[PDB]
Amino acid sequence: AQNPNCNIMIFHPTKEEFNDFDKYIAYMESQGAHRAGLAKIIPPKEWKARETYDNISEILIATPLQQVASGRAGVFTQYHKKKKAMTVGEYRHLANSKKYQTPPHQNFEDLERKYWKNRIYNSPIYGADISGSLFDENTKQWNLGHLGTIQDLLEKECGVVIEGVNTPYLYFGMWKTTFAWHTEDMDLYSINYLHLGEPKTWYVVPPEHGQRLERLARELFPGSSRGCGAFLRHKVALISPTVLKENGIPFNRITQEAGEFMVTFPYGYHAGFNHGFNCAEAINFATPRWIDYGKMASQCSCGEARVTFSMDAFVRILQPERYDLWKRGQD
Numbered sequence: 001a002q003n004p005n006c007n008i009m010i011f012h013p014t015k016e017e018f019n020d021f022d023k024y025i026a027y028m029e030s031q032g033a034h035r036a037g038l039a040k041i042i043p044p045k046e047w048k049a050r051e052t053y054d055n056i057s058e059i060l061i062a063t064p065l066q067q068v069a070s071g072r073a074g075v076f077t078q079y080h081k082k083k084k085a086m087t088v089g090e091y092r093h094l095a096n097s098k099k100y101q102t103p104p105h106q107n108f109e110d111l112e113r114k115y116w117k118n119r120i121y122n123s124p125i126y127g128a129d130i131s132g133s134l135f136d137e138n139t140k141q142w143n144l145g146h147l148g149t150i151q152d153l154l155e156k157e158c159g160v161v162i163e164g165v166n167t168p169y170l171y172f173g174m175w176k177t178t179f180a181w182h183t184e185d186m187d188l189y190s191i192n193y194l195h196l197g198e199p200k201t202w203y204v205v206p207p208e209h210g211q212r213l214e215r216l217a218r219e220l221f222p223g224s225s226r227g228c229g230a231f232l233r234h235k236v237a238l239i240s241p242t243v244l245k246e247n248g249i250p251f252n253r254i255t256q257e258a259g260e261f262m263v264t265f266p267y268g269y270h271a272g273f274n275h276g277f278n279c280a281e282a283i284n285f286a287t288p289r290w291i292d293y294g295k296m297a298s299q300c301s302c303g304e305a306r307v308t309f310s311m312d313a314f315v316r317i318l319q320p321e322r323y324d325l326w327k328r329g330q331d
C-alpha cells in the first residue's frame with residue numbers, strides 16, 4: 001500500500017507531464033497521494049496562469065463576508081455577515097489597513113500560533129465564492145476553467161446524461177480569513193490555485209479517518225449535532241490542531257504559496273486560513289474513483305447547507321432514496 005502513514009505529498013510534474021490533467025491525477029493516486037486527503041502540485045517552471053495580475057482591481061466583490069466567531073480559541077463557529085459591495089482594489093486596501101493587516105511575525109509557524117491564539121477576537125472580511133476565472137484563455141495546461149465537467153464524467157461512467165454546469169470560483173482573502181472544516185459537495189475532489197499574494201495554510205484529515213473527525217465534532221458542537229446529522233456541511237465549525245492532537249485525531253498540515261496548486265481528494269476533510277491579502281481560484285471535479293464516494297456522501301437535509309443547482313442531479317442519480325428528503329431541505 002503506497003503512502004500508508006497518509007502524509008501530504010508534493011509533486012513536481014515536468015512540462016510534458018502537465019499536459020494531460022486526468023492522467024496526472026491518476027499518477028498521483030498510484031503513488032498514494034489520496035490517502036492524505038490533500039496534495040500539493042508545483043507547476044513546471046515554464047508554466048504560467050496568465051501574463052500579469054496588474055489589471056484585476058476592477059473585479060467586483062458583490063457580497064464580501066465578515067467572518068464573526070463564537071466559542072473558544074481552539075473550538076469555535078463562524079457566521080458570515082454580509083457587507084456592502086467593493087472592488088478588488090478597495091478590498092486589497094482594506095486588507096492592508098492597520099485594522100486588518102498581517103502582524104509582524106518570524107516565520108509561518110509563529111504566524112500559525114498567532115492565528116490560533118487570536119482569531120476569535122477579530123472578524124476578517126472574505127471575498128469568497130465569486131463566479132469567474134483568472135486563467136488566460138491561451139493557458140492550455142491546468143486551466144481550471146477548461147477542465148472536463150463532472151456532468152460529463154457521470155455520463156461517461158454511468159451512461160446517464162444530466163443537466164448542470166461546473167464553473168470556477170474566485171476567493172479574495174485577507175489575514176485570518178478562514179475556511180471551516182468540510183469535505184466537498186457530494187465528496188467531490190477540489191483543485192485550488194493560489195494566483196497571487198500571501199500564503200494559505202491547510203489542515204487535512206485522511207479520508208480513511210474522516211469519521212473520527214465527525215465523532216469529535218458531534219462532541220464539541222453538541223447543539224449543532226442535534227440540529228443536523230451532517231452539520232459539517234454547513235461549513236461553520238473550526239477545531240484547532242492542538243485540540244485535534246488532544247483528541248487523537250489524525251491530521252496533517254501544509255502551507256500553499258502563490259503559484260502552487262492544491263488538490264483535495266474525496267472525503268478529505270480540510271480547514272485553513274489565509275496569511276494576508278491573496279486571490280485563489282478553485283473548482284470541483286470528478287474521476288472514476290469518485291463515483292463510489294458520491295454514492296455514499298452524507299447529506300444535510302435540515303435546510304442550512306443550501307447548494308448549487310448542479311447538485312440536484314448528482315443526488316437524484318447517485319442517491320435516489322435520499323433524494324426526496326434532501327430536496328425538501330433545498331426548498
Ligand SMILES: O=C(O)CNC(=O)C(=O)O
Nearest residue numbers: 171179190191192264282
Ligand atoms: O480557499 C478557500 O477558502 C477554501 N477552499 C477550499 O475549501 C477548496 O479549495 O476545496
Ligand SMILES: [Mg+2]
Nearest residue numbers: 056057058059
Ligand atoms: Mg479589473
Ligand code: NI
Nearest residue numbers: 183184190264
Ligand atoms: Ni474545500
Ligand SMILES: [Zn+2]
Nearest residue numbers: 228300302304
Ligand atoms: Zn444541516
